[PDB]
């Protein structure tokens, strides 16, 4: 679950800041539950 | 599929092809040489006798007195022959006339660079091994010679830079085929080693100008 | 205080240089009289890079004009901007080069190399510090090839820690203009590979193809090709003459674009080239510039870049543009055209930006590309040379002037040595086990 | 009795310092001629400008800055710009020949004949200063002069001043982005000296600031100036406790013993929390409870590394503005229970928070908006270890065929100076792996 | 080049004839001679044999 | 490992004679190669690792990345052939402070620098065959303030020929040493 906005950005997001390049506002906070 | 720097490759799974894979590391087609042409003629004073302890080339002439300026470049241009009764004659003639015979190699040295490049430029491994072995014998067979080759390092070493990365990767298993020195990486590193040992103090910067991965001793 | 001494040799080099001076004089607002009445603020700033100021308020170029025929210097003098040069730097012989490398190099270059060396000594000593030299010529003619490279060899021996810039017009594959040009090109390249630090190869055929397909020109004269050459030969010195958000002079590009000390042959280009009607209906952005920069049609040399892997790419931009846009454009171009770039070099693109755009253009870019595509031009020259040399076609105009037969077969040897290393660095991968 | 000396080397350092000094002039009442107006005045005292400026008798303020580059092409716009009367003309040091992206050139060949002048000017600036503890240098890790001349400058200053603290502000090269070809060589060579002579070396990538200006700020196609302004705000945040009185003031030596556990692990990250545009700042109350969470976001770091593949060591969080200690107390207590933000078992405290009372200033013609509360986070984490394995990969990709090496052998440097520094970076990676293990 | 302070690497026109002053008055005199030269060159006020010393 | 071994006067941990010399040894190869070669100097097998980058190709003493060996014996002997190239090695040492400390010697170093985890001293070799006599106890006593209890790994890098890497207790001079060492 998410009892904060920080955990929504933090845990379930699949974004790798070291790898992902030039992503927009929506491709950071994409979750695993969206895919499956 | 795609082609290159176009809107074809601007797509979403545009698979781009690749380059045409240029002519490096591939054996170039051979050409007839002057050695076979002069040998079928029969002007060479050599004859093959099969001794029990191996094949030995028999000379019907005093090997000390011979026009090296006419014979040594002719034998060196015969290294490009892969057919079996000619490669022995070229190799053994070079070895015998380099070992039996001194203080005549030096004026011939500016004439034998083009056959050496011709032998090395054929990208076959056996001929490269043989010309590296005879170059190692050549740079040590006489005096005053190794630092006479040092202006011509720009015409030998360019293809020596190709095959310095050819060794066996068997980490624990011993390479059994060590007596027949057929792997070319160590042979190239020993040839460059002999070019540094004999060749004076100007050889290192020339080898570095040709082979950039080189490590110097002394 | 970083100043460059300019030289031009031969009938092609003189026209190329004259168009070059016409271009950069209007860049800095210099009238044909030699006087400054431009409009921009930054024009008179770094004019000491290329010019000298005389008493009375004139601006003379730092140009030394060398010829072997006297009838080609007054054509340059009687041009639009031919009256700005000093008359003392006009060195010229009396007997023509005869399209002979022999007469350009050995027995009619030897008596005029002294005078031009004293003139270039006088020009390259009034400076406080010196960065390098420029020479514009062609590898097909007699005094464009035999004299200019001898001059390069005799200048390199005196200034060994300064850069050298050669902008050569190599003979075209299917466009033939002289009979004897393979001999001149083969004699010239083997010592243009050991005496200068940056060389640009421009083919007349590729320039014609650009003028036909890109520019949509009906009748392109020889002025338009020289304008094309000057549009990219002056884009590599705009970091010296104008401030930018990320500057890169000649030596910066010499370090970045040259991985190994011989592969310094480059392919120029210009980004915002557009037709006469398509100019007005055009949107000019950095992703718009990159497609015309990187395509094979805009290459000024007749070597297809799709035929080999890029070693290092330079892209000097002119105009007030963003940096993330150029950044992401080069990143995309490298990322999904991944098989056309060297994989043992991580990033192959150098980016430079300048704030002063060319006049009439709101955004421009110039391309310097070191590719293994250039290996086919040298092989083409060797193939066009070996047919003549096999039967000793025209050697009596050279050997009768005095040479040895080995002096022609060593040029081919150095040509093949140049080809093999480009082949090797094209096929070399990051690991050293996959080619065998 | 507090001051700082700023040495901006390289084109990147000088262009950063332009925005930095315009910011510092706007932070006080100083006009760009260097004089305070008499028509109007701000509420300032003599203890504010002592850190960065010096006072003459007539009323002219002079920065404690040295602008040195081997090029002219970045310094004459300082001499001919709007901030041309602010600087003493001898501080603006201009060379003749270029570094040509060579560590070798700027370390051996061209920097050796200019270092005796910049060191003398640094000496002359450090004798007008009563206190000590300054030396805030700015350079990039990719160029030639900013990696070569800065290394020699730190080498000389370490034996000339002994202890001090060489504060170092790097622009480290981005993972997938570089504007040069020989950047890994320069970065490894300058890391070999920054790793042993800088006391805590700050890290910033250009690509992550591009992303932050892309998403947090709503601007499209940003330029270098937008990056430099945010970097200047970060630097002004550090020295905010040296010029304005707050609840928990932090000296420059105070947070060096708090952030840096071991003599080599001194490469902290940065995070600036309320970086939002003018059309967005007025529609939300940027309270402490959410700007604290904006510091720990994976996408708000200006170094391209997720903190999620590492364990935090210490954080120095410097609030400013309308901030109360119980607010940051509750904000830190909120983070400490989240099981994603992992901490090492040998640092049970884990935090260091300072509170200031002076809000950040705006630059007319800038991009940020006036916020009441701003947070600057200084995270020391194991996550930066993955940013140097890629530098190792980029160095071994090119060094393995000795590409571009002969341009560096040509100016003074012997061949094994590359292996000598690569072994030091490998030792650094192993140290980061060793320090991050749990205790059984 | 008018608003250039002291040590300055730009090309100030007509500067290598200014004789015995500092940088600032040298720049002032140099740009004044430059402007005088341009204005006398284009606008035809002076008669023949009167536009140069 | 090596906790239940007797740990007598010496402990061989590598040898070029046998079936699998690099059994417990990891083998990373990148732009390099590893092979066994009959030497023309000692007329016996040697190991042979080299490459352009000395750091990419190496061998580590325990195979598993997290497993560590425990050797009580203080000394370290390495019969390494000098090829006049770039050769490094590196050990890891446990102390009474119960921390892990690393000593690295490289052919291209000229200064002795002391750090809390690393200590990079130089090392010089002779012409042909020689044994590098290392003293871990004295190098922990002199450069650092602590003592020596265990060594945790050794790591041999490129451009060298390895034969019989072993630890010992006392420096066996020439005669009390057995002929097989
Ligand atoms: N983040 C940021 N980086 C900059 C800026 N200006 C230049 N750079 C960086 O500078 C790097 C290029 O090297 P520089 O430091 O500019 O070169 P230099 O120190 O002047 O040395 P030379 O190349 O010889 O002129 C690029 O990778 C940029 O990331 C800037 O304003 N902001
Ligand atoms: N770009 C350009 N090329 C030219 C021009 N005139 C001649 N050429 C080329 O120059 C080559 C001949 O070189 P040449 O002038 O004889 O060199 P030189 O003998 O040293 O003077 C021909 O192949 C032409 O294609 C010109 O005006 N512009
Ligand atoms: Mg610079």
Three-class secondary structure of residue D294 per DSSP: helix
Q: Does chain A reach chain D with at least 3 CB pairs under 8 Å?
A: yes
Distance CA B170, CA C122 (A): 65
As given in the structure block, the two tokens for residue F175 are 């005669």
With CA atoms as reference, report the closest residue to F134 among F73, F91, F75, F94: F75
- Classify burial at E19, counting beta carbons within 10 Å of its beta carbon; exposed 0-12, middle 13-18, buried 19 or more: exposed
Same domain assignment for residues D188 and D273:
no
Same domain assignment for residues D136 and D21:
yes
Residues of D in contact with E8 (CB under 8 A): 76, 79-80
Distance CA D98, CA D77 (A): 18
Q: Which domains are assigned to chain C? A: 3-257 (3.40.50.1440), 265-374 (3.30.1330.20), 375-425 (1.10.287.600)
C142 lines ligand 2 (CB under 6 A): yes
Of D336, D370, D385, the residue that ends a domain is D385
- Cβ within 8 Å, pair D74-C251: no
> How many Å lie between the centroid of ligand 3 and the Cα of residue D103?
12
DSSP structure string for C290-338: HHHHHSSTT-SSS--GGGS-EEEEEEEEESS--HHHHHHHHHHHHHHSG
CATH code for the domain in which residue D314 is found: 3.30.1330.20
In a domain, D19, yes or no: yes
Same domain assignment for residues D275 and D168:
no
Nearest Cα residue in chain C from A21: C328
Return the best residue to mutate from C169, C232, C397 for the ligand 2 pocket (most ligand atoms within 8 A of CB): C169
> How many Å lie between the centroid of ligand 1 and the Cα of residue D31?
29
Same domain assignment for residues D349 and D331:
yes
Q: How was this structure determined?
A: cryo-EM
Measured between CB atoms, which of C128, C252, C345 is closest to D397?
Answer: C345
The residues of D assigned a catalytic role are: 254
β partners of residue C59? C53
- CB D64 within 8 Å of CB D134: yes
Assess C432–F contact: CB distance below 8 Å, yes or no.
yes
In a domain, D397, yes or no: no
Same domain assignment for residues D226 and D275:
no
Assess D207–A contact: CB distance below 8 Å, yes or no.
yes
Q: How many domains does chain D have?
A: 2
Measured between CB atoms, which of B165, B172, B217 is closest to F36?
Answer: B172
- CB D317 within 8 Å of CB D408: no
Query: Using alpha carbons only, how large is chain A's radius of gyration in Å?
Result: 10
In a domain, D209, yes or no: yes
CATH code for the domain in which residue D105 is found: 3.40.50.1440
Distance CA B212, CA C258 (A): 14
β partners of residue D350? none
> How many Å lie between the centroid of ligand 3 and the Cα of residue C290?
25
Length of chain A: 36
- CB D8 within 8 Å of CB D65: yes
In a domain, D326, yes or no: yes
With CA atoms as reference, report the closest residue to F29 among F15, F49, F2, F11: F49
Same domain assignment for residues D251 and D323:
no
Cα D382 versus chain centre, distance? 19
Of D370, D385, D400, the residue that ends a domain is D385
As given in the structure block, the two tokens for residue C227 are 């304008």
In a domain, D85, yes or no: yes
β partners of residue D168? D137, D201
Measured between CB atoms, which of C340, C416, C421 is closest to B4?
Answer: C340
Kindly state the helix (H) or strand (E) to which residue D80 belongs, with its residue range: helix D76-80
Q: Which of D68, D76, D90 to mutate to test the interface with E (most CBs of E within 10 A)?
A: D76
As given in the structure block, the two tokens for residue D148 are 């070569």
Same domain assignment for residues D252 and D275:
no
In a domain, D181, yes or no: yes
In a domain, D364, yes or no: yes
- CB C302 within 8 Å of CB C400: no
Backbone region of residue C332 per phi and psi (left: phi > 0; alpha: psi in -120 to 50; beta: other values)? alpha
- Classify burial at B213, counting beta carbons within 10 Å of its beta carbon; exposed 0-12, middle 13-18, buried 19 or more: middle
**Ligand 1 atom nearest to D139, measured from its CA:** 15
How many CB atoms within 10 Å of residue B15?
A: 11
For residue C214, what is the DSSP state?
I
Same domain assignment for residues D139 and D163:
yes
- Cβ within 8 Å, pair B215-F85: yes
Which residue's CA is the nearest one to ligand 2's atom 24?
C177
Distance CA B60, CA B56 (A): 13
Backbone region of residue C43 per phi and psi (left: phi > 0; alpha: psi in -120 to 50; beta: other values)? alpha
- CB C103 within 8 Å of CB C142: yes
Query: Using alpha carbons only, how large is chain D's radius of gyration in Å?
Result: 21
CB contact residues (below 8 A), chain F span 21-80, against chain C: 30-31
Which residue's CA is the nearest one to ligand 2's atom 16?
C141
Residues of F at the B interface (Cβ-Cβ below 8 Å)?
20-22, 27, 29, 31, 33-38, 45, 52, 84-86, 159
With CA atoms as reference, report the closest residue to F63 among F15, F17, F27, F18: F27
The strand pair at C129-138 and C90-92 is best described as unpaired
For residue F174, what is the DSSP state?
S
Which residue's CA is the nearest one to ligand 2's atom 21?
C10
For residue C265, what is the DSSP state?
E
Same domain assignment for residues D221 and D310:
no
Resolution in A: 3.6
- CB F49 within 8 Å of CB F32: yes
> How many Å lie between the centroid of ligand 2 and the Cα of residue C7?
16
As given in the structure block, the two tokens for residue C73 are 């210097």
Kindly state the helix (H) or strand (E) to which residue C135 belongs, with its residue range: strand C129-138
Three-class secondary structure of residue C185 per DSSP: helix
In a domain, D199, yes or no: yes
Backbone region of residue D135 per phi and psi (left: phi > 0; alpha: psi in -120 to 50; beta: other values)? left
C225 lines ligand 2 (CB under 6 A): yes
Three-class secondary structure of residue F58 per DSSP: strand
Same domain assignment for residues D247 and D221:
yes
Three-class secondary structure of residue C285 per DSSP: coil
Feature table: binding site of C for Mg(2+):
69
Backbone region of residue D255 per phi and psi (left: phi > 0; alpha: psi in -120 to 50; beta: other values)? alpha
Cα D323 versus chain centre, distance? 25
Same domain assignment for residues D11 and D151:
yes
The CA distance from F50 to the nearest CA of chain D, in Å, is: 12
Distance CA E35, CA E13 (A): 10
- CB C135 within 8 Å of CB C94: no
Measured between CB atoms, which of B3, B7, B159 is closest to C306?
Answer: B3
As given in the structure block, the two tokens for residue C372 are 């293994």
What are the angstrom distances between the C-alpha of B69 and each of B111, B113, D174, D286?
Answer: 8, 13, 62, 92
Distance CA D335, CA D380 (A): 16
β partners of residue D352? D316
Distance CA C430, CA D254 (A): 47
Query: Using alpha carbons only, how large is chain C's radius of gyration in Å?
Result: 21
Distance CA B130, CA B124 (A): 10
Chains with ≥3 Cβ pairs under 8 A against C? A, B, D, E, F
- After which residues are there C–N gaps above 2.5 Å in chain A? none
Three-class secondary structure of residue C383 per DSSP: helix
**Ligand 2 atom nearest to C226, measured from its CA:** 1
Of D224, D259, D294, the residue that ends a domain is D259
Query: Using alpha carbons only, how large is chain E's radius of gyration in Å?
Result: 13
Return the best residue to mutate from D101, D105, D143 for the ligand 1 pocket (most ligand atoms within 8 A of CB): D143
- CB D154 within 8 Å of CB D194: yes
- At a CB cut-off of 8 Å and minimum separation 6, what does C345 contact? C259, C311, C312, D181, D397, D398, D403
- At a CB cut-off of 8 Å and minimum separation 6, what does C44 contact? C28, C29, C36, C38, E1, E11, E13
Same domain assignment for residues D362 and D239:
no
> How many Å lie between the centroid of ligand 2 and the Cα of residue C105?
18
- Cβ within 8 Å, pair D416-F86: yes
Residues of C in contact with B154 (CB under 8 A): 414, 417
**Ligand 2 atom nearest to C202, measured from its CA:** 1
Range of the domain at D140: 3-259
Distance CA C150, CA C415 (A): 18
Measured between CB atoms, which of D264, D423, D431 is closest to F106?
Answer: D423
């Amino acid at each position: 679950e998410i009892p904060k906005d920080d955990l929504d950005f933090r845990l379930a997001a699949l974004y790798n800041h070291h790898t992902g390049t030039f992503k927009n506002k929506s491709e950071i906070l994409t979750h695993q539950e969206t895919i499956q | 599929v795609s082609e290159g720097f176009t809107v074809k490759a601007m797509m979403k799974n545009s698979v781009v092809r690749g380059p045409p894979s240029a002519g490096a590391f591939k054996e170039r087609p051979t050409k007839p040489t002057a050695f076979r042409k002069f040998y079928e003629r029969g002007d060479f004073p050599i004859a093959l006798e099969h001794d029990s302890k191996g094949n030995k080339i028999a000379w019907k002439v005093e090997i000390e007195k011979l026009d090296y300026h006419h014979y040594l470049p002719l034998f060196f241009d015969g290294l490009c022959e892969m057919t079996f009764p000619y490669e022995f004659f070229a190799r053994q003639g070079i070895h015998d006339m380099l070992e039996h015979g001194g203080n005549k190699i030096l004026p011939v040295i500016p004439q034998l660079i083009i056959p050496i490049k011709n032998a090395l430029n054929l990208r076959n491994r056996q001929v490269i091994c043989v010309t590296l072995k005879v170059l190692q014998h050549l740079v040590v067979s006489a005096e005053m010679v190794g630092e006479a080759l040092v202006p011509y390092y720009r015409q030998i070493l360019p293809i020596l830079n190709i095959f310095k990365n050819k060794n066996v990767n068997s980490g624990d298993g011993i390479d059994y085929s060590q007596q027949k020195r057929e792997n070319i990486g160590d042979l190239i590193q020993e040839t460059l080693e002999a070019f540094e040992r004999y060749g004076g103090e100007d050889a290192f910067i020339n080898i570095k100008y040709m082979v950039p991965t080189y490590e110097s001793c002394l | 205080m970083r100043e460059i001494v300019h030289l031009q040799a031969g009938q092609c080099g003189n026209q190329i240089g004259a168009k070059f001076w016409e271009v950069i004089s209007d860049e800095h607002g210099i009238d044909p009289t030699g006087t400054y009445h431009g409009d921009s603020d930054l024009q008179l700033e770094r004019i000491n890079v290329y010019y000298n100021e005389a008493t009375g308020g004139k601006y003379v170029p730092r140009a030394v004009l060398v010829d072997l025929e006297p009838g080609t210097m007054d054509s340059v003098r009687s041009g639009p901007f031919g009256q700005i040069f000093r008359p003392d730097n006009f060195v010229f012989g009396q007997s023509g080069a005869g399209n002979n490398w022999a007469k350009g190099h050995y027995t009619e270059g030897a008596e005029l190399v002294d005078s031009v060396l004293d003139v270039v000594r006088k020009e390259a000593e009034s400076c406080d510090c010196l960065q390098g030299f420029q020479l514009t010529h062609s590898l097909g003619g007699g005094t464009g090839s035999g004299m200019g490279t001898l001059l390069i060899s005799k200048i390199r021996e005196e200034y060994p820690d300064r850069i050298m810039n050669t902008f050569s017009v190599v003979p075209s594959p299917k466009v033939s203009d002289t009979v004897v040009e393979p001999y001149n090109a083969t004699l010239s390249v083997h010592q243009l590979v050991e005496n200068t630090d940056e060389t640009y190869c421009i083919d007349n055929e590729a320039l014609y193809d650009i003028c036909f397909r890109t520019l949509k020109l009906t009748t392109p004269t020889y002025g338009d090709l020289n304008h094309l050459v000057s549009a990219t030969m002056s884009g590599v010195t705009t970091c010296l003459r104008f401030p930018g958000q990320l500057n890169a002079d000649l030596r910066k590009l010499a370090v970045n674009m040259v991985p190994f000390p011989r592969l310094h042959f480059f392919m120029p280009g210009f980004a915002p080239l557009t037709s006469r009607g398509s100019q007005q209906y055009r949107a000019l952005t950095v992703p718009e510039l990159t497609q015309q920069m990187f395509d094979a049609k805009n290459m000024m040399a007749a070597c297809d870049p799709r035929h080999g892997r890029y070693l290092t790419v330079a892209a000097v931009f002119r105009g007030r543009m963003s940096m993330k846009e150029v950044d992401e454009q080069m990143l995309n171009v490298q990322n999904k055209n991944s098989s056309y770039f060297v994989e043992w070099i991580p990033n192959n693109v150098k980016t430079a930006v300048c704030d002063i755009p060319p006049r009439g253009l709101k955004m421009s870019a110039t391309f310097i590309g070191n590719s293994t595509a250039i290996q086919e031009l040298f092989k083409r020259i060797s193939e066009q040379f070996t047919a003549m040399f096999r039967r000793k076609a025209f050697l009596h105009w050279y050997t009768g002037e005095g040479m040895d037969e080995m002096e022609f077969t060593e040029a081919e040897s150095n040509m093949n040595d140049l080809v093999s290393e480009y082949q090797q660095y094209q096929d070399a991968t990051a690991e050293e086990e996959g080619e065998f | 009795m507090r001051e700082c000396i700023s040495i901006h080397v390289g084109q990147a350092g000088v262009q950063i310092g332009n925005a930095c000094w315009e910011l510092y002039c706007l932070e006080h009442g100083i006009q760009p001629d260097g004089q305070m107006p008499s028509d109007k005045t701000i509420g300032g005292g003599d203890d504010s400008f002592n850190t960065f400026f010096s006072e003459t008798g007539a009323g002219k303020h002079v920065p404690r800055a040295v602008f040195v580059d081997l090029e002219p092409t970045v310094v004459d716009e300082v001499r001919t710009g709007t901030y041309r009367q602010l600087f003493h003309p001898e501080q603006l040091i201009t060379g003749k020949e270029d570094a040509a992206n060579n560590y070798a050139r700027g370390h051996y060949t061209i920097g050796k004949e200019i270092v005796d002048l910049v060191l003398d000017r640094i000496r002359k600036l450090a004798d007008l200063c009563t206190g000590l503890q300054g030396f805030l240098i700015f350079h990039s890790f990719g160029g030639g002069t900013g990696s070569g001349f800065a290394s020699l400058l730190m080498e000389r200053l370490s034996v000339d001043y002994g202890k001090k603290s060489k504060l170092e502000f790097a622009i480290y090269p981005a993972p997938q982005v570089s504007t040069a070809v020989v950047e890994p060589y320069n970065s490894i060579l300058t890391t070999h000296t920054t790793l042993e002579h800088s006391d805590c070396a700050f890290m910033v990538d250009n690509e992550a600031i591009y992303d932050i200006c892309r998403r947090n700020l709503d601007i499209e196609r940003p330029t270098y100036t937008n990056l430099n302004r945010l970097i200047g705000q970060i630097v002004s945040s550090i020295t905010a406790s040296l010029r304005f009185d707050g609840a928990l003031n932090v000296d420059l030596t105070e947070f060096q013993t708090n952030l840096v556990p071991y003599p080599r692990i001194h490469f902290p990250l940065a995070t600036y929390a309320p970086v939002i545009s003018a059309e967005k700042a007025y529609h939300e109350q940027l309270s402490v409870a959410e700007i604290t969470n904006a510091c720990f976001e994976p996408a708000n770091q200006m170094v391209k590394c997720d903190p999620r593949h590492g364990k935090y060591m210490a954080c120095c969080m410097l609030y400013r503005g309308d901030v109360v200690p119980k607010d940051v107390n509750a904000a830190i207590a909120t983070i400490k229970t989240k099981r994603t933000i992992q901490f090492v078992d040998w640092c049970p405290t884990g935090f260091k928070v300072g509170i200031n009372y002076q809000p950040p200033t705006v630059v007319p013609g800038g991009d940020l908006a006036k916020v009441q509360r701003a947070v600057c986070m200084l995270s020391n984490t194991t996550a930066i270890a993955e940013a140097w394995a890629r530098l190792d990969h980029k160095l071994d990709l090119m060094y393995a065929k000795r590409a571009f090496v002969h341009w560096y052998v040509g100016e003074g440097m012997e061949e094994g100076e590359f292996s000598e520094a690569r072994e030091d970076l490998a030792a650094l990676e192993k140290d980061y792996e060793e320090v991050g293990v749990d205790s059984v | 080049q008018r608003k250039a302070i002291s040590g300055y690497a730009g090309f100030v026109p007509r500067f290598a004839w200014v004789m015995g002053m500092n940088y600032r008055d040298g720049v002032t005199q140099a740009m004044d001679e430059f402007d005088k030269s341009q204005f006398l060159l284009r606008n035809p006020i002076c008669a023949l044999g009167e536009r140069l010393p | 490992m090596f906790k239940n071994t007797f740990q007598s006067g010496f402990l061989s941990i590598l040898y070029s004679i046998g079936s699998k010399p690099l059994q417990i040894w990891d083998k990373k190869v990148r732009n390099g190669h590893i092979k066994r070669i009959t030497d023309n100097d000692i007329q016996s097998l040697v190991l042979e690792i080299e490459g352009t980058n000395v750091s990419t190709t190496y061998i580590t003493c325990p195979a598993d990345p997290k497993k560590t060996l425990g050797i009580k014996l203080p000394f370290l002997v390495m019969i390494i052939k000098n090829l006049k190239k770039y050769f490094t090695f590196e050990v890891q040492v446990l102390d009474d402070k119960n921390v892990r400390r690393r000593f690295r010697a490289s052919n291209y170093q000229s200064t002795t620098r002391v750090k809390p985890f690393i200590c990079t001293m130089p090392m010089r070799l002779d012409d042909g065959w020689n044994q590098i006599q290392f003293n871990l106890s004295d190098f922990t006593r002199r450069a650092y303030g602590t003592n020596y209890i265990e060594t945790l790994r050794v790591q041999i890098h490129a451009n060298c020929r390895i034969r019989r890497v072993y630890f010992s207790d006392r420096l066996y001079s020439e005669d009390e040493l057995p002929a097989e060492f």
